Specification:
Belongs to the DNA repair metallo-beta-lactamase (DRMBL) family. The protein is α/β, with parallel strands linked by helices. The chain has eight helices and 18 strands. The strands form three sheets. The protein has a seven-stranded mixed sheet with strand order 13-12-14-11-15-17-16, with helices on both faces. A six-stranded mixed sheet has the order 6-7-8-9-10-18. The structure holds nickel (II) ion.
């Protein structure tokens, strides 16, 4: 049955709630982004109205074959009326097409649902600046002070400089990047750009990227692996066995692999600066785990909440254990006492 934290009080709405069958009293299903834990349950047989971004609606139609008549895409940063309730979609700084949803309830309550997000000071100057928010449904994925990570910009600088050095030293090295969902496209696009190559990938992955409105994409990606020196593979194949096997398939064009796994967090973060990251190496294969996050660090999440000053916080992540729930509730109280709301 649908958990309470996916239901919007005072409305007929649910958020990211497609795996529970017909939710009783739900008149419109919202989808924050195209990640499988959130869309689980959608297909060509869904016949209720789904509300989402334009990019998410491209993916629903082309990848899951949802019929057009049931997809209701909304423009960002624009006041819209859904089943009699004002809503606004905001950029969530997560993966392409990901949104936060502002609900303006008929009784005067204002609710923000962050979906999955990576908090940023640029959010402090959207339509959020313009009114009070009473209830926050918060992506608490990394809600503990051990979770620090570098900016995305620092991580991309490291990856470009590492790849450019390796291929300039050895023009016969191949660069491989792992993927299993949309998101983190900057990693592989930035590396292909510095090298003067397209990114090569499977037809299924090319199709998915063609749904994303990324400018000049026909210029950066391809299904012709032979013409590319940056290849995308499934995340599961980024290990020594999988990479040895791939290198065999390339027919002696290449004699070394440099591979990247963009993880969220790993405990090497508590000790090591980005500058200091080193790969795991076996023979002519090296694998780098880089801390490229599309979720808030602890400090980014704290700053957002202390700026927004909500009256009530509802976590949406790590809610399954009493220890996790009590840990989060204790940080929420700290933040409120320190800031004075
Ligand atoms: Ni996500």
């Amino acid at each position: 049955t649908c958990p309470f934290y996916k239901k919007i009080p005072g409305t007929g709405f649910t958020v990211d709630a497609f795996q529970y069958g017909v939710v009783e009293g739900c008149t419109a299903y919202f989808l924050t982004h195209f990640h499988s834990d959130h869309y689980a349950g959608l297909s060509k047989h869904f016949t209720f109205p789904v509300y989402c971004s334009e990019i998410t609606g491209n993916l629903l139609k082309n990848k899951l074959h949802v019929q057009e008549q049931y997809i209701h895409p909304l423009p960002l940063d624009t006041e819209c009326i859904v089943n009699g309730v004002k809503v606004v979609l905001l950029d969530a700084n997560h993966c392409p097409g990901a949104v936060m949803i502002l609900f303006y309830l008929p009784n005067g309550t204002v609710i923000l649902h962050t979906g999955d997000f990576r908090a940023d000071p640029s959010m402090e100057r959207s339509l959020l600046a313009d009114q009070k928010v009473h209830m926050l449904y918060l992506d608490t994925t990394y809600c503990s002070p051990e979770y620090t990570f570098p900016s995305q910009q620092e991580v991309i600088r490291f990856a470009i400089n590492t790849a450019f050095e390796a291929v300039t030293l050895n023009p016969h090295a191949l660069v491989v990047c792992g993927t299993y969902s949309i998101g983190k496209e900057k990693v592989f696009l930035a590396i292909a750009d510095v090298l003067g190559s397209k990114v090569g990938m499977s037809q299924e992955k090319y199709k998915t990227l063609q749904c994303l409105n990324i400018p000049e994409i026909n210029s950066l990606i391809t299904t012709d692996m032979c013409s590319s020196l940056v290849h995308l593979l499934p995340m599961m194949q980024i290990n020594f066995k999988g990479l040895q096997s791939h290198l065999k398939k390339c027919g002696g064009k290449y004699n070394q692999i440099l591979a990247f796994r963009p993880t969220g967090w790993t405990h090497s973060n508590k000790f090591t600066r980005i500058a200091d990251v080193i790969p795991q190496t076996k023979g002519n294969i090296s694998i780098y785990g880089i801390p490229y996050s599309e979720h808030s660090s602890y400090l980014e999440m704290k700053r957002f909440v202390q700026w927004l000053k909500p009256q009530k916080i509802i976590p949406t992540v790590n809610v399954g254990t009493w220890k996790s729930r009590s840990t989060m509730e204790k940080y929420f109280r700290e933040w409120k006492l320190e800031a004075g709301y």
